[PDB]
Enzyme design. Structure first.
Site, PDB file in Angstrom:
ATOM      1  N   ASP A   1      -3.936  -6.571   6.581  1.00  0.00           N
ATOM      2  CA  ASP A   1      -4.629  -6.240   5.345  1.00  0.00           C
ATOM      3  C   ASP A   1      -5.839  -5.363   5.648  1.00  0.00           C
ATOM      4  O   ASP A   1      -6.506  -5.537   6.674  1.00  0.00           O
ATOM      5  CB  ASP A   1      -5.048  -7.497   4.575  1.00  0.00           C
ATOM      6  CG  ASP A   1      -3.856  -8.193   3.935  1.00  0.00           C
ATOM      7  OD1 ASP A   1      -3.242  -7.583   3.024  1.00  0.00           O
ATOM      8  OD2 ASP A   1      -3.527  -9.329   4.373  1.00  0.00           O
TER       9      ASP A   1
ATOM     10  N   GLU B   1       2.591 -10.379  -6.824  1.00  0.00           N
ATOM     11  CA  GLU B   1       2.552 -10.681  -5.407  1.00  0.00           C
ATOM     12  C   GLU B   1       1.186 -11.309  -5.150  1.00  0.00           C
ATOM     13  O   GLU B   1       0.166 -10.785  -5.597  1.00  0.00           O
ATOM     14  CB  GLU B   1       2.797  -9.428  -4.575  1.00  0.00           C
ATOM     15  CG  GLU B   1       3.010  -9.748  -3.103  1.00  0.00           C
ATOM     16  CD  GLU B   1       2.892  -8.569  -2.158  1.00  0.00           C
ATOM     17  OE1 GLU B   1       2.012  -7.708  -2.413  1.00  0.00           O
ATOM     18  OE2 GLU B   1       3.652  -8.516  -1.142  1.00  0.00           O
TER      19      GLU B   1
ATOM     20  N   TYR C   1      10.700  -4.352   0.401  1.00  0.00           N
ATOM     21  CA  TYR C   1       9.360  -3.793   0.326  1.00  0.00           C
ATOM     22  C   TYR C   1       9.356  -2.447   1.043  1.00  0.00           C
ATOM     23  O   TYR C   1       9.463  -2.381   2.268  1.00  0.00           O
ATOM     24  CB  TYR C   1       8.322  -4.769   0.901  1.00  0.00           C
ATOM     25  CG  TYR C   1       6.893  -4.479   0.515  1.00  0.00           C
ATOM     26  CD1 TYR C   1       6.334  -3.231   0.781  1.00  0.00           C
ATOM     27  CD2 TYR C   1       6.094  -5.428  -0.098  1.00  0.00           C
ATOM     28  CE1 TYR C   1       5.025  -2.949   0.441  1.00  0.00           C
ATOM     29  CE2 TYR C   1       4.784  -5.157  -0.451  1.00  0.00           C
ATOM     30  CZ  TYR C   1       4.258  -3.900  -0.192  1.00  0.00           C
ATOM     31  OH  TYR C   1       2.973  -3.601  -0.530  1.00  0.00           O
TER      32      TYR C   1
HETATM   33  O1  LIG Z   1       1.585  -5.880  -0.871  1.00  0.00           O
HETATM   34  C1  LIG Z   1       0.699  -5.685  -0.038  1.00  0.00           C
HETATM   35  N1  LIG Z   1      -0.465  -5.120  -0.365  1.00  0.00           N
HETATM   36  C2  LIG Z   1      -0.733  -4.669  -1.725  1.00  0.00           C
HETATM   37  C3  LIG Z   1      -0.249  -3.255  -1.950  1.00  0.00           C
HETATM   38  O2  LIG Z   1      -0.930  -2.322  -1.059  1.00  0.00           O
HETATM   39  P1  LIG Z   1      -2.311  -1.620  -1.557  1.00  0.00           P
HETATM   40  O3  LIG Z   1      -2.114  -1.274  -3.017  1.00  0.00           O
HETATM   41  O4  LIG Z   1      -2.506  -0.382  -0.694  1.00  0.00           O
HETATM   42  O5  LIG Z   1      -3.404  -2.644  -1.364  1.00  0.00           O
HETATM   43  C4  LIG Z   1       0.916  -6.020   1.411  1.00  0.00           C
HETATM   44  C5  LIG Z   1       2.206  -6.237   1.881  1.00  0.00           C
HETATM   45  C6  LIG Z   1       2.433  -6.520   3.213  1.00  0.00           C
HETATM   46  C7  LIG Z   1       1.363  -6.584   4.098  1.00  0.00           C
HETATM   47  O6  LIG Z   1       1.583  -6.903   5.466  1.00  0.00           O
HETATM   48  C8  LIG Z   1       2.664  -6.430   6.075  1.00  0.00           C
HETATM   49  F1  LIG Z   1       2.870  -5.145   5.829  1.00  0.00           F
HETATM   50  F2  LIG Z   1       2.530  -6.577   7.380  1.00  0.00           F
HETATM   51  F3  LIG Z   1       3.775  -7.059   5.735  1.00  0.00           F
HETATM   52  C9  LIG Z   1       0.070  -6.378   3.642  1.00  0.00           C
HETATM   53  C10 LIG Z   1      -0.147  -6.093   2.307  1.00  0.00           C
HETATM   54  O1  LIG Z   2      -0.678  -3.285   4.957  1.00  0.00           O
HETATM   55  C1  LIG Z   2      -1.238  -2.506   5.726  1.00  0.00           C
HETATM   56  N1  LIG Z   2      -2.096  -1.574   5.305  1.00  0.00           N
HETATM   57  C2  LIG Z   2      -2.786  -1.638   4.021  1.00  0.00           C
HETATM   58  C3  LIG Z   2      -2.026  -2.416   2.970  1.00  0.00           C
HETATM   59  O2  LIG Z   2      -2.517  -3.787   2.897  1.00  0.00           O
HETATM   60  P1  LIG Z   2      -3.705  -4.154   1.869  1.00  0.00           P
HETATM   61  O3  LIG Z   2      -4.646  -2.966   1.792  1.00  0.00           O
HETATM   62  O4  LIG Z   2      -4.384  -5.386   2.421  1.00  0.00           O
HETATM   63  O5  LIG Z   2      -3.016  -4.439   0.549  1.00  0.00           O
HETATM   64  C4  LIG Z   2      -1.016  -2.636   7.206  1.00  0.00           C
HETATM   65  C5  LIG Z   2      -1.835  -2.071   8.180  1.00  0.00           C
HETATM   66  C6  LIG Z   2      -1.564  -2.268   9.522  1.00  0.00           C
HETATM   67  C7  LIG Z   2      -0.479  -3.050   9.899  1.00  0.00           C
HETATM   68  O6  LIG Z   2      -0.189  -3.273  11.271  1.00  0.00           O
HETATM   69  C8  LIG Z   2      -0.886  -4.210  11.903  1.00  0.00           C
HETATM   70  F1  LIG Z   2      -1.252  -5.210  11.124  1.00  0.00           F
HETATM   71  F2  LIG Z   2      -0.189  -4.727  12.886  1.00  0.00           F
HETATM   72  F3  LIG Z   2      -1.982  -3.714  12.430  1.00  0.00           F
HETATM   73  C9  LIG Z   2       0.337  -3.625   8.938  1.00  0.00           C
HETATM   74  C10 LIG Z   2       0.059  -3.420   7.604  1.00  0.00           C
END
Ligand SMILES: O=C(NCCOP(=O)(O)O)c1ccc(OC(F)(F)F)cc1
Ligand SMILES: O=C(NCCOP(=O)(O)O)c1ccc(OC(F)(F)F)cc1
Ligand SMILES: O=C(NCCOP(=O)(O)O)c1ccc(OC(F)(F)F)cc1
Ligand SMILES: *Cc1c(COP(=O)(O)O)cnc(C)c1O
Ligand SMILES: [Cl-]
Ligand SMILES: [Cl-]
Ligand SMILES: [Cl-]
Ligand SMILES: [Cl-]
Ligand SMILES: [Cl-]
Ligand code: NA
EC number: 4.2.1.20
Lengths: 253, 393
Positions: free
Chosen positions: A60, A49, A175
């Protein structure tokens, strides 16, 4: 191409889950990002991804926000991202490649043209982070017209109507955010589930598969190794290699 | 499914991550309920009257218009408690939060006025208020930051991204996605994802309702045009809403031209940006050719939201409202003019609306026209800005 379908069939035959790293394209630069991605594959990543740097990555957390900043510091643009994607597919014909996109980058030069570009470079799926399924029609239609799977998040609290929409509209994989959802999704014939968010250790990969998910996605854990080792690219790759190998081993039967 | 239409023509929508949709759906349901509840209406009207000081005056400006055929009135949102129109909608949104059983408010702010408005509403209604503000903004808006803290709000400096309004918006939403069971996100303009453009319009619509009653009382007819500045769209849509169906009444929205449209250093996305999807909505915005979100520039920081409410984009597209721009220098001249000739110090935001009306008058001084300018705020906050510019000259 049906790269996800092919992967899941093969993994199923091996009684194995998928391990899927998330990284930002062009973090911390183009050439090192390409090396990072080759390293993740050679360590046993089943799919990728990949994030395209965007000014305002709402969904993020700090680790990935920082990755985007690093990529911007390197002058990485979506156009450069697509050049990288073509090169990655050219090196690796079967691995499913999914993008994590924000809506503005998809809508920017026209939604159809975006998905056509994905098809041209050999991408398999696109998750548009800020398009909820209720408003996804133009995105998923364009995706499917260009043989791209549209990916949807299924939140842990999802109601029945949301489960049905995700199961109907998504392709490739569902997902699933970090056993009831998993069984409902199977009931409604959804794309196989990958569990994502906060997966940082082998134990969590194994737990995801045991719960009935087809695999697990890890991003922050992987990008942290990049951030940790900015000064030492060679060690960066070794540490990525050992981490991915360990995580992949945990998915094995 | 939604109860209300989230779009205005092709603009608007609910472009948020899936996890935030329940929060928006909950809010829409609560709003639709509230709008049908006479008790809610009565409580809101009571706070507006007895706490905020509604109705606000409608002031004629004979000294400015002398010798022309323009009659000019200012709708005096500068006289509202807090010194700007933003107070109206924060009181409605704070009541909504209570209706939904929420005990906490999250808000974003750029130039600090929405932060202060959110903090005062939260203090009055006994809510726990936290405000996200870009660190660059925290640095350049220390009077407003101090006001927020006096009113018991927690002000959280945002270091992520470019440390400005859009980063503060992002932190507010991230927080809300986790906290919405107990916290309401008090968005500061008539933009963002549905239902916020609709809610903010409805909780600002008394501006235009009052203006209509007052102009009929004083002149026996409706205005030829109503004119309002457009940063995100709230004061303008509040002035315009009650006149949309009065097809003879012109609706003129004024975006900041900054140093001039040609310079690129402006804040006029509606007329000089490109439609994008960001901030939860499809709307014209300031963005690079490859779709990275940029900033608006104006002498007035309150006009710096780099997009615009989707109802304004829609009213423009169908030709119901016209949008223009005014430069920093034109706004400064209008600011000086109002101080000297009427003894009112206008917000530099509002000064953009006044500047356009002055242009309408001066370009065609023998045209019969009855104009209302929405004077969205007072300009005490801007006297140092104006002093510094005039001194460096
Ligand atoms: O795949 C994603 N992140 C990597 C896996 O999470 P983490 O291992 O906690 O970084 C990931 C997927 C979707 C996303 O945005 C939303 F949820 F809105 F669709 C943000 C990050
Ligand atoms: O994905 C989320 N969290 C962590 C995973 O992403 P990442 O750590 O970047 O891989 C994550 C956090 C908040 C969210 O809602 C909004 F964006 F609207 F605030 C959607 C996705
Ligand atoms: O313009 C906005 N806020 C006004 C802040 O007012 P001020 O304190 O005067 O800068 C504003 C805030 C949020 C927003 O949408 C979303 F939440 F999605 F990001 C759209 C506009
Ligand atoms: C914040 C502000 C504005 C701009 O916001 P809108 O939502 O476009 O009304 C205008 N005038 C004043 C006095 C303000 O404080
Ligand atoms: Cl369906
Ligand atoms: Cl009344
Ligand atoms: Cl009436
Ligand atoms: Cl009369
Ligand atoms: Cl005199
Ligand atoms: Na704007």
């Amino acid at each position: 191409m049906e790269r996800y379908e092919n992967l899941f069939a093969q993994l199923n035959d091996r009684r194995e889950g998928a391990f899927v790293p998330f990284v930002t394209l062009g973090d911390p630069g183009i050439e090192q990002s390409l090396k990072i991605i080759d390293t993740l594959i050679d360590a046993g990543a089943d799919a990728l991804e990949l994030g395209v740097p965007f000014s305002d990555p709402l969904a993020d957390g700090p680790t990935i926000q920082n990755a985007n900043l690093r990529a911007f510091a390197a002058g990485v643009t979506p156009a450069q991202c697509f050049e990288m994607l073509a090169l990655i597919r050219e090196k690796h014909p079967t691995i499913p490649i999914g993008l994590l996109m924000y809506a503005n980058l998809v809508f920017n030069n026209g939604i159809d043209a975006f998905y056509a570009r994905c098809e041209q470079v050999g991408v398999d799926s696109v998750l548009v982070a800020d398009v909820p399924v209720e408003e996804s029609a133009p995105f998923r239609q364009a995706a499917l017209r260009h043989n791209i799977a549209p990916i949807f998040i299924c939140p842990p609290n999802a109601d029945d109507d949301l489960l049905r929409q995700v199961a109907s509209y998504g392709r490739g994989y569902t997902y699933l955010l970090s056993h009831h959802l998993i069984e409902k999704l199977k009931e409604y014939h959804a794309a196989p589930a990958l569990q994502g968010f906060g997966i940082s250790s082998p134990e969590q990969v194994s737990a995801a598969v045991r719960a009935g998910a087809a695999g697990a996605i890890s991003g922050s854990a992987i990008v942290k190794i990049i951030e940790k080792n900015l000064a030492s690219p060679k060690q960066m790759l070794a540490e990525l290699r050992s981490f991915v190998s360990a995580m992949k081993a945990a998915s094995r039967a | 499914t939604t109860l209300l239409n989230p779009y205005f023509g092709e603009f608007g929508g609910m472009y948020v991550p899936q996890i935030l949709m329940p929060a928006l759906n909950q809010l829409e349901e609560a709003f639709v309920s509230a709008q049908k509840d006479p008790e809610f209406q009565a409580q809101f009207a009571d706070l507006l009257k007895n706490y905020a000081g509604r109705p606000t005056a409608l002031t004629k400006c004979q000294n400015i218009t002398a010798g022309t055929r323009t009659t000019l009135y200012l709708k005096r949102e500068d006289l509202l408690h807090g010194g700007a129109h933003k107070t109206n909608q924060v009181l409605g949104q704070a009541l909504l939060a209570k209706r939904m059983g929420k005990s906490e408010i999250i808000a974003e702010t750029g130039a600090g006025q929405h932060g202060v408005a959110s903090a005062l509403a939260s203090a009055l209604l006994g809510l726990k208020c936290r405000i996200y503000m870009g660190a660059k903004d925290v640095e350049r808006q220390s009077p407003n930051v101090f006001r927020m803290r006096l009113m018991g709000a927690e002000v959280i400096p945002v270091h992520s991204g470019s440390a400005t309004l859009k980063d503060a918006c992002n932190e507010a939403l991230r927080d809300w996605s986790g906290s919405y069971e107990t916290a309401h996100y008090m968005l500061g303009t008539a933009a963002g994802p549905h239902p916020y453009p609709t809610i903010v319009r409805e909780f600002q619509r008394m501006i235009g309702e009052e203006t209509k009653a007052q102009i009929l009382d004083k002149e026996g007819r409706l205005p030829d045009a109503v004119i309002a500045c457009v940063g995100g769209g709230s004061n303008a849509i509040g002035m315009f809403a009650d006149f949309i169906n009065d097809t003879s009444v012109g609706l003129i929205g004024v975006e900041p031209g900054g140093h001039g449209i040609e310079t690129g250093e402006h804040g006029a996305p509606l007329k000089h940006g490109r439609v994008g999807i960001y901030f939860g909505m499809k709307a014209p915005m300031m963005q690079t050719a490859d779709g990275q979100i940029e900033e608006s520039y104006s002498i007035s920081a309150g006009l710096d939201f780099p997009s615009v409410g989707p109802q304004h984009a829609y009213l423009n597209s169908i030709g119901r409202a016209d949008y223009v721009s005014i430069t920093d220098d034109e706004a400064l001249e209008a600011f000086k003019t109002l101080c000297r000739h009427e003894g009112i110090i206008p917000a530099l935001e509002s000064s953009h609306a006044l500047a356009h009306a002055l242009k309408m008058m001066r370009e065609q001084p023998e045209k019969e026209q009855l104009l209302v300018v929405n004077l969205s705020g007072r300009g005490d906050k801007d006297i140092f800005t104006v002093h510094d510019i005039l001194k460096a000259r």
